[PDB]
Amino acid sequence: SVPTKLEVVAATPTSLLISWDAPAVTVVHYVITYGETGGNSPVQEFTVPGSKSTATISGLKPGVDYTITVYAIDFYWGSYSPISINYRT
Amino acid sequence: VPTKLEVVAATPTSLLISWDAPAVTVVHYVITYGETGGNSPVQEFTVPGSKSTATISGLKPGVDYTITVYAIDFYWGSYSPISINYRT
Amino acid sequence: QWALEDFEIGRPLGKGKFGNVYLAREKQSKFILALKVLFKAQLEKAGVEHQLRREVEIQSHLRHPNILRLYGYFHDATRVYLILEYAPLGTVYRELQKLSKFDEQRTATYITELANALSYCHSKRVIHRDIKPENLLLGSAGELKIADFGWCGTLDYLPPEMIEGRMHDEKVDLWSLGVLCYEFLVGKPPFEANTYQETYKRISRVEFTFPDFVTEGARDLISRLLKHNPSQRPMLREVLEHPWITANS
Amino acid sequence: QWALEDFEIGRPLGKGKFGNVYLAREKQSKFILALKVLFKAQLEKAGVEHQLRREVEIQSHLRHPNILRLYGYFHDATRVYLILEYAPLGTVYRELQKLSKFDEQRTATYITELANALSYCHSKRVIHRDIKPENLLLGSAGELKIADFGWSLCGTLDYLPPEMIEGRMHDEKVDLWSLGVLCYEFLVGKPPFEANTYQETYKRISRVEFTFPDFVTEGARDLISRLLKHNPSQRPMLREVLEHPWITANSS
Ligand SMILES: O=C(Nc1c[nH]nc1-c1nc2cc(CN3CCOCC3)ccc2[nH]1)NC1CC1
Ligand SMILES: O=C(Nc1c[nH]nc1-c1nc2cc(CN3CCOCC3)ccc2[nH]1)NC1CC1
């Protein structure tokens, strides 16, 4: 599970701050996908520099549950095995 | 390289030398020996690179010999020899 | 997107240069396969990722019965996993270690498989495929399968236009093909010398000899394949139609 | 013959995982030199020790103003020392990483010098010279010097044509593709096919997928395009590249 420490640091009815433990390895960039869990509408993607260890997701509806999947991309060997966590807010 | 080169055993007719592993791939070793000081040109025979010992036969007793061995790298040639004196 | 939890790892098959290989079965399909596991630490210390990553893309577009299949790859924090076809009969390098050499029936057969695999690569404009005993596996039906990934050296199998530092073409495969045929019969590289300076000359001057137990048919083929001038070397189509292999296959 | 006891090793000039390069000078004459140290283990472990031994002989029987010289070599139990010419102004990589972009003349000038060497190398059958920024040094008079003496978002893939990456037949026409890539890098400040992953870049090279920013002049946009072509034969000759108007105008 790379990244490993995918968790929620801050949150709010408008936006949501996510974080993950530094991979201790060269990462080109992170791909984050989030959407209504349980098999709902398609997800939304956006990338994050490979140096950062956090990410902000804005424009969410309060109450719904979301599966936040974070992909760590390795230049040579593509993405690692992602890590997903559910969050309600 | 070789860094160490001692005489583990010997006889009045021949001698047996040994050296250490240089932590590097060696093609083979060239063994040269003769009366240390200068009586006549020395001899030269080769020993495979995997072996760490040799046997020089045909040495008279009571002759301070000077055996010199220098390894040979496959790509970069010979190493700096390491000479040691011994009295038969 | 494969993952380490998708396979039933089992008996180890060997120990490569940058890691070890295991035997496993695809959980969701029960398909057997070889799973090469290479430690990144050993890969980055020598800088060989791009050499293997480049070979992956080259062979990924190459799917021939005599070329080991690469179905996919995955990685983790400290290991890179290659999902490789299984070869129940082992590696040809093990055969030459157990037999010391091959009979003209086994060589002419292997030379016929490689000449085909090489011609298929030429069709895709791919040249200079390492076909040393290390990178040759034996499939189920005794089928020789090429496996170019990683894990003197390759110098012995280099033509005289590459050690000298000059442009080369598809004829480097005819050289290595003849060099390989010489080892299967004799069990030694024809241009194996003590030092680099010596190994270089023998290859640049073509200084090799045929033992007494080398027939005229084989001697003629090796002679034709081992030509200093790449233009003087034959064509893969002609090799397949050589009398020595048309009778020993 | 050479030995380690004939050099006054001055301050370092570079420290990496592949090797170290120290400032040095001949003792008898006090002649400034550059000593490049490499480890056999890494070379043997990677299968490059042969290539390194091949370059030493090749780069000893050829001299050129824009080609760094190899004044000899020696070795010990673990290391392999190379006696290299000194280059006061450093490598174009660092000078590029700082300024990011070069003048329209500096680029056209660098391309002019590199083209001459490649023709001098392509004549002696010495095809394919790695001329990435890391292997380009700057001399006292501000001139380039190709320094291909082993190792040193993407890596060495950004400078290879589709013939090399795909393992196909290559010839002296790969040098032209490199000039087009390097020329694009001096003006824009990044390889044209640079991407985020190895596969992404591999696809852009094999498909020749790149674009010119607006600030790229028209003259440079014609030479770089004439060099970055999939077919290696369609490319020009090192003589025609020297005759390109944009070069003859801004170069020096
Ligand atoms: O590519 C490799 N292996 C393979 C990819 N596909 N298939 C293999 C491989 N390696 C094989 C090795 C053996 C024989 N040994 C004795 C019996 O079981 C353990 C190994 C037999 C079949 C083998 N197949 N490298 C490791 C060193 C062998
Ligand atoms: O072979 C190399 N370099 C050289 C070959 N010939 N000369 C060099 C070299 N290395 C150079 C480094 C510098 C800048 N430093 C700060 C100012 O004083 C000199 C050192 C300038 C010029 C240099 N030239 N490899 C470089 C270390 C990665």
Author numbering:
A (entry chain B): 5 to 93
B (entry chain E): 6 to 93
C (entry chain A): 127 to 277, 290 to 387
D (entry chain D): 127 to 278, 289 to 388
Reproduce passages from the article.
Aurora A kinase is one of the key regulators of mitotic events, including mitotic entry, centrosome maturation and spindle formation, as well as assisting in neuronal migration. We note that in Aurora kinase sequences a tryptophan residue, Trp277, is immediately following the DFG motif and displays a drastically different orientation whether Aurora A is in an active (DFG-in) or inactive (DFG-out) conformation. This Trp moiety is unique for the Aurora kinase family in the Ser/Thr kinome and its position is suggested to be important for tuning the substrate specificity.
Interestingly, the crystal structure of Aurora A with AT9283 shows that this drug binds to the DFG-in, active conformation of the kinase. Our structure was obtained by co-crystalizing Aurora A with AT9283 and a monobody that binds to the same site as the natural allosteric activator TPX2. Binding of this monobody shifts Aurora A into an inactive conformation, with the DFG-loop in the out conformation. Thus, our structural and kinetic data together support that AT9283 can bind to both DFG-in and DFG-out state of Aurora A, and emphasizes the need for caution when interpreting single X-ray structures. An extended model, where AT9283 can bind to both DFGin/out conformations, followed by a common induced-fit step can also not explain the experimental kinetic traces. These failures, together with the lack of a detectable conformational selection step, led to a new model in which both the DFG-in and DFG-out states can bind AT9283, but only AurAin:AT can undergo an induced-fit step. All data can be globally fit to this model and the overall KD calculated from the corresponding microscopic rate constants (using Equation 5) is in good agreement with the experimentally measured KD. The number of crystals for each structure is one for apo-Aurora A and Aurora A + AMPPCP and two crystals for Aurora A + Mb + AT9283.
